[PDB]
């Protein structure tokens, strides 16, 4: 387990370093003398490169190392399933980490990347702007609908179970028997400790579905365009798809500043979007 | 670092406590405001 100590030191030594003594100059600009609203660090210059620490870590090397040492080092479940299952037992938690944390990172660094320069953000507002603009060019996915249903299904299963077991020493204690108080309200648990197995098959199966949906959109899939409503618009229509493709198709057209080589003339007071301004 | 295991008995350990907060700031605020 010496690898986990060398990975958690490089990932924590670069993240705290980039958001304190770095820059960019290749893609916009942030982390200006330890004074940023997000403290982001990724950039990823458009493309052995050099041989320094200030010139090499400027155009890139920051996210190029956080995705090389943080993704490969990984471990976690791979290091615990060979020390716990050998001493104590029950290597079930290793399956949840190899989907809810292993697939969640391996998708944003092997799908969007080289499929081309700037991949994703690694901060607070950096990962919030890339998941906002990146979801603007697509959205309304069938697979990504499961990844959002799992985060609301596993969290609700822990909230309805944590508030039903605590209110179930005294007359309560802890021996279940609350299958008649909750059963008359909504369904019923078959018990058998399936409360922990259902939550594990929800957060791990959702992260694996949302990662597979994001790994497909980048590698050329479909997503956008209902196909049925996109071809059936001769004149008057308007729906929940006609107002969504207009709030993302006109919003992504203007304000373009991501690409420092593809984008050029877009203003001149003749662009898209017109209602009131 | 021998001795016995810690839990909630060791605080500042007397020496190397205030000097530790004077040695770190002597290489952070210096290597930032005038390196």
């Amino acid at each position: 387990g010496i690898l986990l100590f060398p990975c958690a030191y490089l990932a924590l030594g670069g993240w705290l370093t980039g958001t304190t003594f770095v820059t960019s100059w290749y893609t916009h600009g942030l982390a200006s003398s330890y004074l940023e609203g997000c403290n982001f660090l990724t950039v990823a210059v458009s493309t052995e490169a050099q041989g320094d620490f200030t010139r090499w870590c400027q155009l890139g090397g920051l996210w190029t190392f956080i995705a090389l040492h943080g993704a490969f080092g990984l471990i976690g479940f791979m290091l615990r399933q060979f020390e716990i299952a050998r001493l104590v037992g029950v290597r079930p938690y290793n399956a949840i980490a190899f989907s809810a944390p292993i697939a969640v990172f391996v998708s944003v660094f092997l799908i969007y990347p080289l499929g081309f320069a700037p991949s994703f953000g690694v901060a607070a507002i950096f990962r919030f702007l890339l998941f906002f603009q990146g979801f603007h060019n697509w959205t309304l996915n069938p697979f990504h609908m499961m990844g959002v249903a799992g985060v609301l299904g596993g969290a609700l299963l822990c909230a309805i179970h944590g508030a039903t077991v605590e209110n179930t020493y005294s007359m309560v204690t802890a021996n279940r028997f609350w299958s008649q108080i909750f059963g008359i309200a909504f369904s019923n648990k078959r018990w058998l400790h399936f409360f922990m197995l259902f939550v594990p098959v929800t957060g791990l199966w959702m992260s694996a579905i949302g990662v597979v949906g994001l790994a497909l959109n980048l590698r050329s899939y479909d997503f956008i365009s209902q196909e049925i409503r996109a071809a059936e618009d001769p004149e008057f229509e308007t729906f929940y798809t006609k107002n969504l493709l207009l709030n993302e198709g006109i919003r992504a057209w203007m304000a373009p500043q991501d690409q420092p080589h593809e984008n050029f003339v877009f203003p001149e007071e003749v662009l898209p979007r017109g209602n009131a301004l | 670092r021998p001795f016995s295991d810690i839990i909630t008995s060791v605080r500042y350990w007397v020496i190397h406590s205030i000097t530790i907060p004077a040695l770190f700031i002597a290489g952070w605020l210096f290597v930032s405001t005038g390196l």
């Binding site: 030594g13 003398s33 | 670092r1 021998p2 770190f24 700031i25 952070w28 605020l29 290597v31």
Partner: peptide, 30 residues
């Protein structure tokens, strides 16, 4: 465990917590 360090290992990387505390106070005052 080791009897040479053991516990004294994580504190080496945590030293960077104070380095980021002073660098953030030097760029906000000037």
């Amino acid at each position: 465990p080791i009897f040479t360090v053991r516990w004294v290992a994580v504190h080496t990387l945590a030293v960077p917590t104070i380095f980021f505390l002073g660098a953030i106070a030097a760029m906000q005052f000037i």
